[PDB]
Design an enzyme around this catalytic site. Structure first.
Site, mmCIF file in Angstrom:
data_model
loop_
_atom_site.group_PDB
_atom_site.id
_atom_site.type_symbol
_atom_site.label_atom_id
_atom_site.label_comp_id
_atom_site.label_asym_id
_atom_site.label_seq_id
_atom_site.Cartn_x
_atom_site.Cartn_y
_atom_site.Cartn_z
ATOM 1 C CG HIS B 15 -9.757 20.285 23.751
ATOM 2 N ND1 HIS B 15 -9.548 20.197 22.394
ATOM 3 C CD2 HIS B 15 -11.071 20.563 23.910
ATOM 4 C CE1 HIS B 15 -10.683 20.422 21.759
ATOM 5 N NE2 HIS B 15 -11.622 20.647 22.658
ATOM 6 C CG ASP B 17 -9.062 19.468 18.309
ATOM 7 O OD1 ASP B 17 -8.951 18.419 17.640
ATOM 8 O OD2 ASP B 17 -10.065 20.209 18.258
ATOM 9 C CE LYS B 18 -3.820 24.365 21.831
ATOM 10 N NZ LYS B 18 -2.924 23.900 20.728
ATOM 11 C CD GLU B 43 -0.494 17.655 9.947
ATOM 12 O OE1 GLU B 43 -0.952 18.157 11.001
ATOM 13 O OE2 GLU B 43 -0.014 18.335 9.017
ATOM 14 C CD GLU B 56 5.142 13.545 3.512
ATOM 15 O OE1 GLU B 56 4.162 14.265 3.818
ATOM 16 O OE2 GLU B 56 5.027 12.401 3.022
ATOM 17 C CE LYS B 148 -14.143 23.658 23.889
ATOM 18 N NZ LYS B 148 -14.946 23.393 22.674
ATOM 19 C CG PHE B 217 -17.099 17.333 30.883
ATOM 20 C CD1 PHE B 217 -16.540 16.316 30.112
ATOM 21 C CD2 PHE B 217 -16.671 18.629 30.658
ATOM 22 C CE1 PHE B 217 -15.600 16.601 29.134
ATOM 23 C CE2 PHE B 217 -15.731 18.915 29.687
ATOM 24 C CZ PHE B 217 -15.192 17.899 28.924
ATOM 25 C CG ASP B 225 -14.589 16.296 20.028
ATOM 26 O OD1 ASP B 225 -15.099 15.934 18.939
ATOM 27 O OD2 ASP B 225 -14.053 17.408 20.179
ATOM 28 C CB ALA B 226 -12.124 12.700 16.733
ATOM 29 N NE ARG B 231 -11.077 21.001 13.530
ATOM 30 C CZ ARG B 231 -11.872 19.983 13.220
ATOM 31 N NH1 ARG B 231 -11.510 19.091 12.302
ATOM 32 N NH2 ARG B 231 -13.043 19.860 13.820
ATOM 33 C CE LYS B 232 -10.332 23.492 20.136
ATOM 34 N NZ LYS B 232 -10.774 23.104 18.763
ATOM 35 C CE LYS B 252 2.005 23.583 8.848
ATOM 36 N NZ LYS B 252 1.141 24.774 8.600
ATOM 37 C CE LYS B 256 7.598 22.181 6.763
ATOM 38 N NZ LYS B 256 8.680 21.206 7.074
ATOM 39 C CG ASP B 258 1.913 28.822 7.167
ATOM 40 O OD1 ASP B 258 1.901 29.882 6.504
ATOM 41 O OD2 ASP B 258 1.132 27.874 6.951
HETATM 42 C C1 LIG Z 1 -18.612 18.730 22.896
HETATM 43 S S1 LIG Z 1 -17.354 18.261 21.915
HETATM 44 C C2 LIG Z 1 -17.719 18.406 20.281
HETATM 45 C C3 LIG Z 1 -18.996 17.745 19.769
HETATM 46 C C4 LIG Z 1 -18.880 16.224 19.753
HETATM 47 N N1 LIG Z 1 -18.007 15.817 18.670
HETATM 48 C C5 LIG Z 1 -20.228 15.574 19.575
HETATM 49 O O1 LIG Z 1 -20.232 14.402 19.143
HETATM 50 O O2 LIG Z 1 -21.281 16.205 19.855
HETATM 51 C C6 LIG Z 1 -16.077 19.312 21.997
HETATM 52 C C7 LIG Z 1 -15.348 19.418 23.319
HETATM 53 O O3 LIG Z 1 -16.248 19.722 24.379
HETATM 54 C C8 LIG Z 1 -15.742 19.124 25.560
HETATM 55 N N2 LIG Z 1 -16.737 18.169 26.078
HETATM 56 C C9 LIG Z 1 -16.831 16.847 25.824
HETATM 57 N N3 LIG Z 1 -17.866 16.306 26.495
HETATM 58 C C10 LIG Z 1 -18.446 17.292 27.179
HETATM 59 C C11 LIG Z 1 -19.582 17.393 28.102
HETATM 60 N N4 LIG Z 1 -20.308 16.288 28.400
HETATM 61 N N5 LIG Z 1 -19.843 18.611 28.611
HETATM 62 C C12 LIG Z 1 -19.118 19.707 28.316
HETATM 63 N N6 LIG Z 1 -18.073 19.679 27.479
HETATM 64 C C13 LIG Z 1 -17.702 18.519 26.902
HETATM 65 C C14 LIG Z 1 -14.450 18.401 25.207
HETATM 66 O O4 LIG Z 1 -13.363 19.250 25.547
HETATM 67 C C15 LIG Z 1 -14.575 18.180 23.712
HETATM 68 O O5 LIG Z 1 -13.343 18.101 22.994
HETATM 69 MG MG LIG Z 2 -12.249 19.966 17.564
HETATM 70 MG MG LIG Z 3 -15.340 20.161 17.482
#
Ligand SMILES: C[S@@+](CC[C@H](N)C(=O)[O-])C[C@H]1O[C@@H](n2cnc3c(N)ncnc32)[C@H](O)[C@@H]1O
Ligand SMILES: [Mg+2]
Ligand SMILES: [Mg+2]
Lengths: 383, 362, 49
Positions: B15, B17-18, B43, B56, B148, B217, B225-226, B231-232, B252, B256, B258
């Site tokens: 993922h 973010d991960k 970051e 930093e 996910k 998928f 997806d960036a 973010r998790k 971190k 820290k 946190d």
């Molecule tokens: C769906 S995206 C977030 C929305 C995306 N930024 C957009 O442009 O719509 C979030 C996460 O869903 C998962 N994902 C990406 N493509 C997918 C797909 N076609 N079907 C299901 N999950 C997906 C990935 O793990 C991804 O980081």
């Molecule tokens: Mg995200």
């Molecule tokens: Mg998202």
């Protein structure tokens, strides 16, 4: 002596805090797209750093958007316009790494569907929360924290405190007492305020100003007493702030954006996202529900959870916890909610008018507890 | 009937973010190995063909960031353009500003699992672990790193505690290749993944399954997806349970509060439950400017303790020292094992010091 | 009548466009860059790009 007392603390950050710069830029990009194409698919992440704003993410839209201008105008409005402040909109680096939305996501979510049938743009869980302890139905801690930062920005922009810069951090610690599931804020225990400043102004002119012009104008005297601790500019020389010597990202102030530690959070960020992303629209929906229940008199405090699966329209689950502040059962409150609300994104968008380009307003001072937003106007319920 | 649903999610190593969390903590680890006193605030940002480091660092270490990032992405499983990302060819950009030489935290614990965590998130985490495992085996070779999961559990309230009854709904979305068909993936996800992770007594004919609900998928990882560090944080912690003050963990270092005090608060919470004093507990630690010890500690035992809050606080005060400096010493937080925390949750697994219950003396 | 001064940088995994353009045209830089790389023939990890 103690009884059932506790301390609680919430922070807010000003527009110039690097994380909140990213949030506001991402929302400016979203607004820019929605002005021309109301059905724009936006997922804009912003990164802020010494001399740099980077845009990364995905956007499918019919809008012609000049990213350099939107980004620089946003940094202008935030107040970074010279080297002396550590960051200049006129001369900062702006990189753009934006592509279309994955066709796999498009086909699976919204393509060739009636609006009411569009699937959740992602899986996720979202929480909504309301409390009768303030008129705005929010925790006093976060409300005071936000309003302090808003005051600093106000006094900066009308010239009355011209030595203020855009970056700020406040923390409000309130002393609470439990009351049959509700919470009674008793007094403000501590207030911390760090804020970025001029080279000229002396330390104790600022401290006098933060107490007399900022805190006095914001926090009701009923919550202030001789014991209240004030940590105004605690470190001292906080002239270096904003992105310079720092690194911020969109969606790194989600707790500030919401309830300041209270209730719960499912971890989805808000800014840079159109309505199809349920992290935003369902969270807004769930706040609306929680506020409607408390304003409708059905409970003094409440937490709402909803969850979604990507490509599916109806919520996977819905749950209500009233902390025993209602004569009715949580199950009965759920029945009331099911009857009065349709929590599919295709419907939430109509009820909350979420194609309007008003998102940049939400990127600072919190997404909840304010007059003008549709999700803060409670629904009259039928039961 | 006193019944309620609760949902939690988790994500895989692939993922976006991960990915960033793991690289951030990989950078940390690498710095801590050479310099135990390294200050790190790193970051990571991920997008098609790009890994960007920003933050930093005050450290004496000399780190080959190229090697660190590339080995991390390799381990995760992204090794070809057909998968959307490749450690061999991706762009690594470094923008770290390196130099040479307060808060409210929450800890939470529930007796509903052996790991003393909410069932919802434990299952969510384990489903992702299973996919990773079956991908690496070769058992399901069509799997790809990005994934996910989301689990909705039906609970019954029982005098303060919460009693899992059944699994209400399960979501699995996992990136896959272009040959395998939709029925084969869904059968596999149900029979090889879910049924090997979830206890049979929680599964039944009414359990709802949303498996590959998007239908396709193939495009995944930073391409789809960036990704960003931090973010998790609900996935990193209690999956909607307990509470959270705001701070992300990865990138971190231990100085820290946190991160390290959140670990300590967890340690206390788990120790209270494993010590039989609570079936369920939320521990609040208020720190304040200019004091080493916490300014105030509250303990919400949800009525599951025979002992009062003041009694539990007293038990906490003579078995625990919650001054940052002592926390890093006691939990051994200078050591470079932060990368293993950056996927599958920071709480729940015995391998971490803060998940080793302290024998309580009172 | 577009005014164009586009400098391109190429390295491992990256194409950066840097420079100055004043134009009435609507250009999708992602497609334009990727198409040109496709046409050059770099379409797999096994080719280094
Ligand atoms: C769906 S995206 C977030 C929305 C995306 N930024 C957009 O442009 O719509 C979030 C996460 O869903 C998962 N994902 C990406 N493509 C997918 C797909 N076609 N079907 C299901 N999950 C997906 C990935 O793990 C991804 O980081
Ligand atoms: Mg995200
Ligand atoms: Mg998202």
């Amino acid at each position: 002596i103690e009884e059932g007392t506790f301390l609680f603390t919430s922070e807010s950050v000003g527009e110039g805090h690097p994380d909140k710069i990213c949030d506001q830029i991402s929302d400016a990009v979203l607004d820019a797209h929605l002005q021309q194409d109301p059905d724009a698919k936006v997922a804009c992440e912003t990164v802020a750093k010494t001399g740099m704003i980077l845009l990364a993410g995905e956007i499918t839209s019919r809008a012609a958007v000049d990213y350099q201008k939107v980004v620089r105008e946003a940094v202008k409005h935030i107040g970074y316009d010279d080297s002396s402040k550590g960051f200049d909109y006129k001369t900062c680096n702006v990189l753009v790494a934006l592509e279309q939305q994955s066709p796999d996501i498009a086909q699976g979510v919204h393509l060739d569907r009636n609006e009411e049938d569009i699937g959740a743009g992602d899986q996720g869980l979202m929480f909504g929360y309301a409390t009768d302890e303030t008129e705005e139905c929010m925790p006093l801690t976060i409300v005071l924290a936000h309003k302090l930062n808003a005051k600093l920005a106000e006094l900066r922009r009308n010239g009355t405190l011209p030595w203020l810069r855009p970056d700020s951090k406040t923390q409000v610690t309130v002393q609470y007492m439990q009351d049959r599931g509700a919470v009674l804020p008793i007094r403000v225990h501590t207030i911390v305020i760090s804020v970025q400043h001029d080279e000229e102004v002396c330390l104790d002119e600022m401290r006098d100003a933060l107490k007399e012009k900022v805190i006095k104008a914001v926090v009701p005297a009923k919550y202030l007493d001789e014991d209240t601790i004030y940590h105004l500019q605690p470190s001292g020389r906080f002239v270096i702030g904003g992105p310079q010597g720092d690194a911020g990202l969109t969606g790194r102030k989600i707790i500030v954006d919401t309830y300041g530690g209270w209730g719960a959070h499912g971890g989805g960020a808000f800014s840079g996202k159109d309505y199809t992303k349920v992290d935003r629209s369902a969270a807004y929906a769930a706040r609306w529900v929680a506020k409607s229940l408390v304003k409708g008199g059905l409970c003094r405090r409440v937490l709402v959870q909803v969850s979604y699966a990507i490509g599916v329209s109806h919520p996977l689950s819905i749950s209500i916890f009233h902390y025993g502040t209602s004569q009715k059962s949580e199950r009965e409150l759920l029945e009331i909610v099911k009857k009065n609300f349709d929590l599919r994104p295709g419907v939430i968008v109509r009820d909350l008018d979420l194609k309007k380009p008003i998102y940049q307003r939400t990127a600072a001072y919190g997404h909840f507890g304010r007059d003008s937003f549709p999700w803060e106007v409670p629904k009259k319920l039928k039961y």
